[PDB]
Amino acid sequence: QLNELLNAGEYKIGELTFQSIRSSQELQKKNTIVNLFGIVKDFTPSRQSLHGTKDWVTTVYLWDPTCDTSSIGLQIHLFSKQGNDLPVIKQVGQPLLLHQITLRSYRDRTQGLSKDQFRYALWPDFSSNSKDTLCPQPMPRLMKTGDKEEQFALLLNKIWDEQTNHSMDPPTFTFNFNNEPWVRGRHETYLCYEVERMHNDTWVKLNQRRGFLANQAPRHAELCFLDVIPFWKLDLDQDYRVTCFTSWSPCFSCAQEMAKFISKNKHVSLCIKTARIYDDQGRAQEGLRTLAEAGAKISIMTYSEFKHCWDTFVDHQGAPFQPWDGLDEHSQDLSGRLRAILQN
DNA sequence: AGGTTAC
Ligand SMILES: [Zn+2]
């Protein structure tokens, strides 16, 4: 549902027609008034101008999936006579809906300038650690939105965070990645992924193109991982190989979706390293085979991987990886158990 | 004089 919205340039939500940020970053000679809806990648507090009409101004940089991960976004200057009605943004990551913004050149970069009537709507950084990233906004310019643009805003937020959050809490890593064959009460799947580009006949090792994520209650971590893939701006000619590192092997249902991903993407290879083998003693074993037979490459995490995930996806803050007793022992029986699965 | 001010 979200992939195709951002392609044509214009997409509608509620009753308002939005223009993507990438498409907005181009220009015509004349000024054209668009609706925007994105993430605050950076902003500057509302200070009063020192020149010209001296109106109050706040600065935002909106981003959306049509811009790459590393892209800062569209420069937008929001102006107002009173100024005490401009959006009060508290931190980077807030979803932002802007209504009636003019698009023009300034010394060859595209900026947005606010119309007089410009209105807005803000949302908290949902995937932040705080609740109160969103404080009570000034009433004059504020817009009453519903649940429909709730989905959209949260979606953009979720994709943003799942591109600007590599680091994880160290006690979390210990507990979830404990590779003892049967454990309680992990319940959730933690998934740490790498991306590798094809250049010079060998994988270009991508440190900044990494990420990790954890599931919701009751979708799955495997599905949430697949959602950020289309929003990677992947070169269609270049072949890519994903290696994700999971805490639990994917269930039967997510193994099917990860298999149907290999069928949909002809330039993407999928390689899975898991810490435990999830066996529901139902169709989970078949799911490993089905994903396997679809082209995907699965194996058990060994000491090499456990060190690497601690060197990459954890906020060790200087502590080297401290292994638990029986890590190699459990990874051996599991390597036997995995080998037995692909045989049946 | 809609795009100066912000830059
Ligand atoms: Zn699953």
Numbering used by the authors: 30 to 247, 256 to 381
What text appears in the publication on this structure?
Apolipoprotein B mRNA-editing enzyme-catalytic polypeptide-like 3G (APOBEC3G or A3G) is a human host restriction factor that inhibits human immunodeficiency virus type 1 (HIV-1), murine leukemia virus, and equine infectious anemia virus primarily through its deoxycytidine deaminase activity on the viral minus-strand DNA (-ssDNA). A3G inhibits viral replication by preferentially deaminating dC to dU in the viral -ssDNA during reverse transcription. Specific “hotspot” sequences of DNA are targeted for deamination, with the highest preference for the 5’-CCCA sequence (where the deaminated C is underlined) in the case of A3G. Extensive biochemical and mutagenesis studies have shown that a single loop, loop 7, of A3G is responsible for selecting the base at the -1 position (the nucleotide at the 5’ side of the deamination site) of the DNA substrate hotspot.
